[PDB]
Amino acid sequence: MKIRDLLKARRGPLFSFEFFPPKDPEGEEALFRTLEELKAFRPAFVSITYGAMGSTRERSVAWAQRIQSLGLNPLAHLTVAGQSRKEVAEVLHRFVESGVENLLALRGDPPRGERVFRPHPEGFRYAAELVALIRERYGDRVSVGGAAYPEGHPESESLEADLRHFKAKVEAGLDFAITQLFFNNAHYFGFLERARRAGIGIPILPGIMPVTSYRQLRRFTEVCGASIPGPLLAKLERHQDDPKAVLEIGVEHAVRQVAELLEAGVEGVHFYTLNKSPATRMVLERLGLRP
Amino acid sequence: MKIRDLLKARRGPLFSFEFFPPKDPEGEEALFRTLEELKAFRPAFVSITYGAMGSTRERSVAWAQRIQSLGLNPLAHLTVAGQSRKEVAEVLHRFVESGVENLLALRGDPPRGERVFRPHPEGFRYAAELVALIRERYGDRVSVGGAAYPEGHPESESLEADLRHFKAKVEAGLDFAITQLFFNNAHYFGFLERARRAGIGIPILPGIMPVTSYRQLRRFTEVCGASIPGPLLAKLERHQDDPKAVLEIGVEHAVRQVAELLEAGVEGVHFYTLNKSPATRMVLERLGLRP
Numbered sequence: 001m002k003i004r005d006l007l008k009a010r011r012g013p014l015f016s017f018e019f020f021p022p023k024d025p026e027g028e029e030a031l032f033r034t035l036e037e038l039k040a041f042r043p044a045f046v047s048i049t050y051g052a053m054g055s056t057r058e059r060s061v062a063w064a065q066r067i068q069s070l071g072l073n074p075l076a077h078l079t080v081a082g083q084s085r086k087e088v089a090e091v092l093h094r095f096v097e098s099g100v101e102n103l104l105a106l107r108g109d110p111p112r113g114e115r116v117f118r119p120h121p122e123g124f125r126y127a128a129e130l131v132a133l134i135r136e137r138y139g140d141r142v143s144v145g146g147a148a149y150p151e152g153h154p155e156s157e158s159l160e161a162d163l164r165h166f167k168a169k170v171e172a173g174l175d176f177a178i179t180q181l182f183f184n185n186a187h188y189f190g191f192l193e194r195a196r197r198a199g200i201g202i203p204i205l206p207g208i209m210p211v212t213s214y215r216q217l218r219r220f221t222e223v224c225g226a227s228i229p230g231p232l233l234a235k236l237e238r239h240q241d242d243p244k245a246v247l248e249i250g251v252e253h254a255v256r257q258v259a260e261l262l263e264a265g266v267e268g269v270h271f272y273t274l275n276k277s278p279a280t281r282m283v284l285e286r287l288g289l290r291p
Numbered sequence: 292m293k294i295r296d297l298l299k300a301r302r303g304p305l306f307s308f309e310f311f312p313p314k315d316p317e318g319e320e321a322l323f324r325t326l327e328e329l330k331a332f333r334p335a336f337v338s339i340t341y342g343a344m345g346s347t348r349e350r351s352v353a354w355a356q357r358i359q360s361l362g363l364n365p366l367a368h369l370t371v372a373g374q375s376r377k378e379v380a381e382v383l384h385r386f387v388e389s390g391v392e393n394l395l396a397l398r399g400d401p402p403r404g405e406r407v408f409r410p411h412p413e414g415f416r417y418a419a420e421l422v423a424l425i426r427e428r429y430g431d432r433v434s435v436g437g438a439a440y441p442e443g444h445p446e447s448e449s450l451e452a453d454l455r456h457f458k459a460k461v462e463a464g465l466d467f468a469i470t471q472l473f474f475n476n477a478h479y480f481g482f483l484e485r486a487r488r489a490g491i492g493i494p495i496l497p498g499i500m501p502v503t504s505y506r507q508l509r510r511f512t513e514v515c516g517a518s519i520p521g522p523l524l525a526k527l528e529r530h531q532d533d534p535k536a537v538l539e540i541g542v543e544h545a546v547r548q549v550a551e552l553l554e555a556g557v558e559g560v561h562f563y564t565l566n567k568s569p570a571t572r573m574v575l576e577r578l579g580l581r582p
């Protein structure tokens with residue numbers, strides 16, 4: 001089921017989960033359990049993450065298929081970094097032909113260290129280019145999506161620039177967008193108004209991550225340039241050594257974030273689960289989104 | 292000399308500094324040193340903080356007359372916390388008979404560690420009430436600013452309510468607003484849009500604090516509810532013990548910030564100094580201003 005159509009016909013908002021393809025049998029088993037626990041909430045879509053450089057190629061496809069057989073609806077991430085144009089098309093073809101209908105077109109970061117983006121000698125440079133390619137080969141047979149950044153991409157010269165670019169990418173052929181994570185809703189509302197004023201009208205879904213680790217939260221935000229509210233930061237720091245206390249703080253945080261997000265009429269919420277179920281499960285249950 | 296008038300007639304952006312009244316001789320001659328250093332930057336106004344719960348009002352009156360007399364242009368802070376209305380009026384009147392033409396009508400906070408605000412038995416409850424009072428007794432003989440919160444006042448139950456209440460605070464009689472500190476310009480641009488969309492057309496000035504102390508940053512943001520970008524936080528974290536590295540970090544960040552703000556044409560920037568001069572000096576100079 002195309003997400004363009006899922007969004008149009010919405011009786012209500014769409015809740016989606018994000019997962020990454022496990023590196024080892026353990027993780028594979030942790031994911032199987034996670035999907036079981038979560039498929040109960042009846043998500044509109046389910047994302048399968050993609051290793052930049054295309055290292056995890058056959059995993060991402062396998063799991064795209066693993067979710068299909070659970071009767072859920074997959075969203076295939078696809079990046080352009082470290083890959084030829086053929087190589088990017090080949091795996092797109094591999095998705096479509098696995099029956100996948102929904103694609104997040106992403107560029108991907110540069111590797112560890114390495115501060116600037118240099119493409120493959122025959123690869124793409126921007127996500128807008130993969131979106132363009134998708135529409136050119138598949139038109140509307142697939143629903144394409146992209147990344148938005150409420151607090152701006154950490155590489156961008158300005159916020160002016162970051163948004164003009166977001167717009168170019170939408171004009172390339174996006175049907176929706178999902179945001180990078182954010183912990184205070186002003187950041188989303190902020191961006192949404194600024195986008196709509198730029199005459200960008202596609203559905204823009206907030207991405208939410210329920211905090212489960214002080215160390216991870218710090219390390220994640222350092223990479224993607226998101227900011228942690230000072231009260232949350234201190235709360236977490238005071239309790240960082242007690243994993244079940246942290247889980248409760250991250251949940252209470254998400255619950256109250258998501259509750260206003262719903263009250264404000266967002267089209268849906270995309271959940272960064274990190275392949276675990278307790279946090280997202282608890283958030284949804286407290287919101288009354290009843291199994 | 293009224294900020295309302297200075298804003299209409301502004302040659303370039305209005306730079307301004309915030310100060311608090313010191314507790315002992317040591318911090319007083321420290322503030323005169325800082326006033327001596329920063330005043331060559333020809334600021335449009337200089338603001339002095341208030342107030343223990345009025346407990347330190349003699350000090351703010353003393354400094355408001357002291358900055359007037361240096362031929363700098365005073366913006367006198369006034370809270371309603373822990374005082375009856377009559378009391379709040381008397382002090383207001385001591386400012387205005389001093390020659391002060393500019394007032395920042397504020398509420399003040401509860402004691403550290405209490406969540407709910409509890410007014411004085413015979414006191415005001417909202418900054419707005421102070422605005423109204425000032426306008427009742429002094430019409431437009433003075434100019435009145437109030438605070439704006441780009442990431443929302445912590446006490447506010449929704450971001451739609453915080454704005455709704457800010458606008459009411461504007462319609463009470465505001466000429467300008469100054470924002471609480473932010474470390475990513477998205478917070479501010481986002482807020483500006485939302486406010487115009489709500490039809491608040493007054494000048495809203497970004498308030499910037501160049502980070503000089505890691506623990507200090509961590510304590511203030513916990514209280515005030517602002518967020519710290521991931522990259523900055525890990526940067527500071529790395530170098531927290533070397534004060535002059537941290538100073539270097541806070542400066543390159545605030546420069547990056549103020550530069551873009553100026554290039555987008557804000558009417559001015561308001562600088563949280565902590566009564567120290569180097570950080571703000573360094574930002575203005577790197578920005579190409581001459582002492």
Ligand SMILES: Cc1cc2nc3c(=O)[nH]c(=O)nc-3n(C[C@H](O)[C@H](O)[C@H](O)COP(=O)(O)OP(=O)(O)OC[C@H]3O[C@@H](n4cnc5c(N)ncnc54)[C@H](O)[C@@H]3O)c2cc1C
Binds near residue numbers: 051078169181
């Ligand atoms: C929901 C979501 C899912 C993600 N999934 C993955 C994943 O599965 N695998 C993975 O590796 N990463 C993933 N990422 C991370 C993403 O790959 C990185 O943030 C990457 O750095 C940017 O991706 P992008 O598609 O937004 O890049 P782009 O949209 O191409 O932007 C790249 C940079 O160039 C700028 N730009 C755009 N167009 C132009 C132009 N024409 N001229 C000059 N500059 C331009 C943009 O401002 C930006 O700074 C995800 C991110 C999000 C938000």
Ligand SMILES: Cc1cc2nc3c(=O)[nH]c(=O)nc-3n(C[C@H](O)[C@H](O)[C@H](O)COP(=O)(O)OP(=O)(O)OC[C@H]3O[C@@H](n4cnc5c(N)ncnc54)[C@H](O)[C@@H]3O)c2cc1C
Binds near residue numbers: 339398444498
């Ligand atoms: C630029 C700036 C300068 C500052 N200077 C000082 C200072 O000198 N001394 C000091 O102690 N503190 C100072 N502060 C801190 C400030 O006092 C605290 O943040 C205070 O808690 C906020 O009060 P306020 O004046 O902004 O607004 P308030 O109007 O007093 O807001 C308080 C709460 O009530 C809500 N509210 C407003 N009106 C209504 C209503 N009609 N009905 C229901 N709810 C309502 C608001 O959303 C908010 O959550 C300053 C803050 C800023 C941003």
Ligand SMILES: [Cl-]
Binds near residue numbers: 321324
């Ligand atoms: Cl000194």
